[PDB]
């Protein structure tokens, strides 16, 4: 996990186009018609982790190996969802514990453009200031979504710095990043916020919420995976 066959090249609002297939765990969550409503991350061949607020159902589909959503010829994997596991602790009012697991009907066929992201340990400590990356097909301007997958490097923020803006809205299962010239935006939800752990890209956050106008000077708020990974491991083990 965490090692793309195709290495990404790094120099979402104010982000940049990603090298095709360089973020193999990135999936697009779409309805039966092919409408993209959220992103997600493959954690293995049978499971996808996304946000609870995305409201995924078994009627939706997981699209893996995609780069250009405007390309009808591009080879991809449309994977059916067998069961949706929304964290029962998801707070629809505070948005805390914003995570959901998707168990695929048929496993995804891993390849050069389709593989898994690594999951952190509950005790992992990713320091504030660490340069991480987020990806997705969300709006690049606060408008329709970009056809090609976007990426952006951004720093993790300390809870103290984040609270300087969001105050008490920041809960324990949330981690902030950004306010650095880039911003996750409508359509990026459920997607990954990854940081390197011993050289491997590890899921530190899940795009969740933030500025209502996707302001690049405002902290983006992500579901803190270290605070939710135990729930993830428990769910996989039991299913």
């Amino acid at each position: 996990c965490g090692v793309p066959a195709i290495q990404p090249v790094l120099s979402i609002v104010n982000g940049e186009e990603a090298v095709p297939g360089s973020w193999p765990w990135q999936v697009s969550l779409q309805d039966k018609t092919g409408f993209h409503f959220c992103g997600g991350s493959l954690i293995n061949e049978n499971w996808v982790v996304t946000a609870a607020h995305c409201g995924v159902t078994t009627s939706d589909v997981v699209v893996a190996g995609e780069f250009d959503q405007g390309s009808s010829s591009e080879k991809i994997q449309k994977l059916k969802i067998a069961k949706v596991f929304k964290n029962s602790k998801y707070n629809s009012l505070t948005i805390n514990n914003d995570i959901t697991l998707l168990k695929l009907s048929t496993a995804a066929s891993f390849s050069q453009t389709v593989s898994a992201v690594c999951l952190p340990s509950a005790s992992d400590d990713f320091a504030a200031g660490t340069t991480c990356v987020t990806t997705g097909w969300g709006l690049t301007r606060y408008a329709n979504t970009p056809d090609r997958l976007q990426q952006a490097s951004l720093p993790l923020l300390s809870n103290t710095n984040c609270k300087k803006y969001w105050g008490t809205k920041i809960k324990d299962a949330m981690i902030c990043a950004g306010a650095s010239g880039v911003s996750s935006c409508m359509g990026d939800s459920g997607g990954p916020l990854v940081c390197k752990k011993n050289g491997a890209w590890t899921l530190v956050g899940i795009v969740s919420w933030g500025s209502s106008t996707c302001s690049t000077s405002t902290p983006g708020v992500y579901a803190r995976v270290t605070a939710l990974v135990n729930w993830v491991q428990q769910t996989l083990a039991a299913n």
Binding site: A51, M186, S212
Partner: protein, 58 residues
């Protein structure tokens, strides 16, 4: 009809791109809009039919 039917559509703070319906009093019909996935207001429906049954004529 409820006054919430007269409120403009509310995307919210979450970053999803979910299609929902809202009643547009200026046009007299329910229209689609992009909902962020959380903290929806009441003029937010999963189907045009639900929307028309709740806000039609407001």
């Amino acid at each position: 009809r409820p006054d919430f039917c007269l409120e403009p559509p509310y995307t919210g703070p979450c970053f999803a791109r979910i299609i929902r319906y809202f009643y547009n009093a200026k046009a007299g019909l329910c229209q689609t809009f992009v909902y962020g996935g959380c903290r929806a207001k009441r003029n937010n429906f999963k189907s045009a039919e639900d929307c028309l049954r709740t806000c039609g004529g407001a």
